[PDB]
Enzyme design. Sequence first.
Site, short mmCIF file in Angstrom:
data_model
loop_
_atom_site.label_atom_id
_atom_site.label_comp_id
_atom_site.label_asym_id
_atom_site.label_seq_id
_atom_site.Cartn_x
_atom_site.Cartn_y
_atom_site.Cartn_z
N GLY A 1 -7.18 -8.36 5.79
CA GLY A 1 -6.15 -9.30 6.18
C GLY A 1 -4.84 -8.83 5.58
N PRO A 2 -3.72 -9.45 5.95
CG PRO A 2 -2.48 -11.33 6.34
CD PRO A 2 -3.68 -10.61 6.85
CG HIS A 3 0.79 -6.86 2.28
ND1 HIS A 3 0.83 -6.26 3.53
CD2 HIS A 3 2.07 -7.21 2.01
CE1 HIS A 3 2.07 -6.26 3.99
NE2 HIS A 3 2.84 -6.84 3.08
N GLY A 4 -1.05 -9.73 -0.05
CA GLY A 4 -0.55 -10.83 -0.87
C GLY A 4 -1.01 -12.20 -0.43
CE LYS B 1 -6.45 -6.94 -0.78
NZ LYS B 1 -5.78 -5.79 -0.13
CD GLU C 1 -4.60 -2.57 -2.25
OE1 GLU C 1 -3.86 -2.87 -3.23
OE2 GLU C 1 -4.67 -3.23 -1.18
CE1 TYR D 1 6.59 -3.47 2.33
CE2 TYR D 1 5.17 -1.88 1.25
CZ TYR D 1 5.33 -3.06 1.93
OH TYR D 1 4.24 -3.84 2.23
CG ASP E 1 -8.89 -4.50 -1.78
OD1 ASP E 1 -7.91 -4.07 -1.14
OD2 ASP E 1 -8.90 -5.60 -2.38
NE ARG E 2 -5.09 -4.04 2.48
CZ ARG E 2 -4.78 -5.00 3.35
NH1 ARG E 2 -5.39 -5.07 4.51
NH2 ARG E 2 -3.86 -5.90 3.04
NE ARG F 1 -0.49 -6.90 -7.46
CZ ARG F 1 -1.82 -6.94 -7.42
NH1 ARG F 1 -2.45 -7.79 -6.62
NH2 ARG F 1 -2.52 -6.11 -8.18
NE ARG G 1 -1.20 -4.94 -3.76
CZ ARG G 1 -1.77 -6.11 -3.48
NH1 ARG G 1 -1.04 -7.20 -3.34
NH2 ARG G 1 -3.09 -6.17 -3.34
CD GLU H 1 4.06 -4.87 -1.70
OE1 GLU H 1 4.52 -5.62 -0.81
OE2 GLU H 1 3.08 -5.19 -2.39
N1 LIG Z 1 -5.92 -19.04 -4.51
C1 LIG Z 1 -4.67 -18.74 -4.88
N2 LIG Z 1 -3.76 -19.72 -5.01
C2 LIG Z 1 -2.53 -19.41 -5.41
N3 LIG Z 1 -2.01 -18.22 -5.74
C3 LIG Z 1 -2.93 -17.22 -5.63
C4 LIG Z 1 -4.27 -17.43 -5.21
N4 LIG Z 1 -4.91 -16.21 -5.24
C5 LIG Z 1 -4.04 -15.31 -5.62
N5 LIG Z 1 -2.79 -15.86 -5.88
C6 LIG Z 1 -1.55 -15.17 -6.32
O1 LIG Z 1 -0.78 -14.66 -5.18
C7 LIG Z 1 -0.46 -13.24 -5.36
C8 LIG Z 1 -1.18 -12.36 -4.32
O2 LIG Z 1 -2.59 -12.32 -4.53
P1 LIG Z 1 -3.43 -10.94 -4.59
O3 LIG Z 1 -4.85 -11.36 -4.63
O4 LIG Z 1 -2.99 -10.30 -5.84
O5 LIG Z 1 -3.06 -10.19 -3.35
P2 LIG Z 1 -3.73 -9.48 -2.23
O6 LIG Z 1 -4.15 -10.44 -1.18
O7 LIG Z 1 -2.69 -8.57 -1.69
O8 LIG Z 1 -4.87 -8.70 -2.71
C9 LIG Z 1 -0.87 -12.91 -6.78
O9 LIG Z 1 0.29 -13.04 -7.60
C10 LIG Z 1 -1.85 -13.95 -7.18
O10 LIG Z 1 -1.69 -14.27 -8.57
C1 LIG Z 2 -3.72 -0.41 3.78
C2 LIG Z 2 -2.25 -0.34 3.85
C3 LIG Z 2 -1.43 -1.05 2.97
N1 LIG Z 2 -0.08 -0.96 3.08
C4 LIG Z 2 0.77 -1.66 2.11
C5 LIG Z 2 0.62 -3.18 2.11
C6 LIG Z 2 0.77 -3.48 0.65
O1 LIG Z 2 2.12 -3.41 0.17
C7 LIG Z 2 -0.01 -2.37 0.03
C8 LIG Z 2 -1.47 -2.60 -0.01
O2 LIG Z 2 -1.69 -3.61 -0.99
O3 LIG Z 2 0.24 -1.23 0.83
C9 LIG Z 2 0.52 -0.19 4.01
O4 LIG Z 2 1.75 -0.11 4.08
N2 LIG Z 2 -0.27 0.51 4.88
C10 LIG Z 2 -1.65 0.46 4.83
O5 LIG Z 2 -2.31 1.10 5.65
#
Ligand SMILES: Nc1ncnc2c1ncn2[C@@H]1O[C@H](COP(=O)(O)OP(=O)(O)O)[C@@H](O)[C@H]1O
Ligand SMILES: Cc1cn([C@H]2C[C@H](O)[C@@H](CO)O2)c(=O)[nH]c1=O
EC number: 2.7.1.21
Lengths: 313, 313
Positions: free
Chosen positions: B11-14, B17, B38, B56, B114-115, B172, B174, B177
Amino acid sequence: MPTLLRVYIDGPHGMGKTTTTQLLVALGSRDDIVYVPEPMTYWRVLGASETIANIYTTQHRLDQGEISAGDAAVVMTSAQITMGMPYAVTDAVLAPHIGGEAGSPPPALTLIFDRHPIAALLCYPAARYLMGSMTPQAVLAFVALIPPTLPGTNIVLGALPEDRHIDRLAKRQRPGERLDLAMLAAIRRVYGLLANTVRYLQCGGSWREDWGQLSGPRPHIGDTLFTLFRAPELLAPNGDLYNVFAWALDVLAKRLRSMHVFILDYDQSPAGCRDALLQLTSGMVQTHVTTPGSIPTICDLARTFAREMGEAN
Amino acid sequence: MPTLLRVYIDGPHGMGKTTTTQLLVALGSRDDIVYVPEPMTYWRVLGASETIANIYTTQHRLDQGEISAGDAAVVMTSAQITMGMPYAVTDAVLAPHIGGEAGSPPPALTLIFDRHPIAALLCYPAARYLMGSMTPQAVLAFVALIPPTLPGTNIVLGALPEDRHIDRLAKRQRPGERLDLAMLAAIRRVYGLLANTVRYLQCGGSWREDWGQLSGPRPHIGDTLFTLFRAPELLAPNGDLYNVFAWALDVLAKRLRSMHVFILDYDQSPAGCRDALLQLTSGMVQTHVTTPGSIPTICDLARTFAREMGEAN
Ligand SMILES: Nc1ncnc2c1ncn2[C@@H]1O[C@H](COP(=O)(O)OP(=O)(O)O)[C@@H](O)[C@H]1O
Ligand SMILES: Cc1cn([C@H]2C[C@H](O)[C@@H](CO)O2)c(=O)[nH]c1=O
Ligand SMILES: Nc1ncnc2c1ncn2[C@@H]1O[C@H](COP(=O)(O)OP(=O)(O)O)[C@@H](O)[C@H]1O
Ligand SMILES: Cc1cn([C@H]2C[C@H](O)[C@@H](CO)O2)c(=O)[nH]c1=O
């Protein structure tokens, strides 16, 4: 059960590959023999504009110190993705129709392909890597993407002395090419290493047990493609490749292992070369198709490709 | 016969996950649960330097009119090849150990990835295409390269309202970013289209028979990824896609069809999300491994990946 015979004419460019296969199909061999031509139209128009030109220009500017190796590498990479796309998609739709190997028996249909996916996904990138316009990590990324080797993958590599090759290279310059002998040498060396890699593997070769020999007709590791990948960018501090890169070489081995390579000598007349190719055909592996409809579907497939993406075969 | 369970959190980042899976594995669930993180180290160092930054930055300069769409596209493409390489090679070595689906029965081992490869080979490129930094032909080239869908490919896509997503996106970032909401929207839209594409296909969808609907819980063609590819660059003069491009969509369909998607709601607390993921696990497909040694080989594989290419899971 009908059988399909699949032949992939490959090897470095300007050797007589087109000249010899077009004669092969020119024997009036019914409708049982189909030729799949180089997808020049995809390269020059459909996929992007004048890609072959893009490549040769980019290597040139790099050589003239007008761009950094970094800038060259980026362009070269995207260029190559474009070069092999037609290869990948064809193989992708041809997969579900290829069954097991039926020995070596009249092949109901015979596909003569102009180049196999490895040409754009492995062979050329590796040459550019040698030319300094491609990074080793970039190469291994393509390698990790090489599709599983299908049954009956017969690959015909060519042989022709350097001098005669250069001459023929001069006579036929694809739209946008530039005479580059350095590339001619790199491309030639890569293809030699490939044939050896197949043999080496098929005689029980294991790149992991022989890796130490680098770290210093029975081809040793040093005579195979594996030597290219012993670059500093790929080596961990402890002197071993990183696991990602090792696994890629693993996938390289798994893919190459099950390929049947033959070596067509081009140092002769178009007639002879044609006869020799034809002579090789007798000993190439055939395979059964998965459905009765496969043959027509496949026959038509090739025709469509050739029609839509070939310049003049 | 032992069974392996493979889960791909995507799914989309942040969205949460990382936050939710690290809690999932944090239940003290013996050694039967492994998390594959990741591969940030590959992206930032091993494969090339600061790739996430490269991406980015490149979209930024493009947006500021400092580079042409052409220059953006080249960089974006090579960048992506680099992003997904770790994905491709892992799947490539994991292939020979995955056997048929064993229904839904204690999974001897559980891999939480993770992905999935489609993220870098399809999902992100398609977003960049939407952002104008990627060409459709470039996207379909990656598509044609997507590895065959292995049995038991369980993909968990997430759900979270735009507003809550943005907030978490802020917290969060990266290394390298740049907050880009346009990308957040494109990435979100692509992932929605994907889930729909799976459903659409699994309910007897055929992109070829529905193509005309474009040319003007029961998702129609228009709600699927196929809509993106109805671009002028891909259309022949007679209004149909060229055969190369059509076959690519064919391969798209063949790959997506056999995937099991689940939708994890993230609009809740880390504890809850963890429980929900865990709850979903019960209903995910397991598969037998091809050899008795597969489990250890696989267990170790994941460990090696995580060790060598993870930043901090
Ligand atoms: N269930 C949640 N509720 C609120 N904030 C969350 C939750 N899960 C993660 N976060 C916060 O949101 C940000 C993105 O989550 P993260 O799991 O790190 O990203 P990603 O989906 O890219 O893997 C992080 O700063 C994290 O602390
Ligand atoms: C998997 C993937 C992540 N990303 C970016 C999204 C997020 O900033 C980070 C993965 O957490 O990298 C890409 O730009 N291309 C990709 O193919
Ligand atoms: N057997 C041969 N002897 C001499 N010249 C040849 C022979 N076959 C092809 N040629 C010439 O050499 C050039 C390269 O051959 P061609 O088949 O067109 O290239 P390629 O190997 O790249 O497909 C062409 O100009 C062709 O006319
Ligand atoms: C297949 C392939 C050919 N080429 C070049 C070699 C020739 O000039 C032409 C193919 O005849 O394109 C590449 O640069 N990369 C490739 O991947």
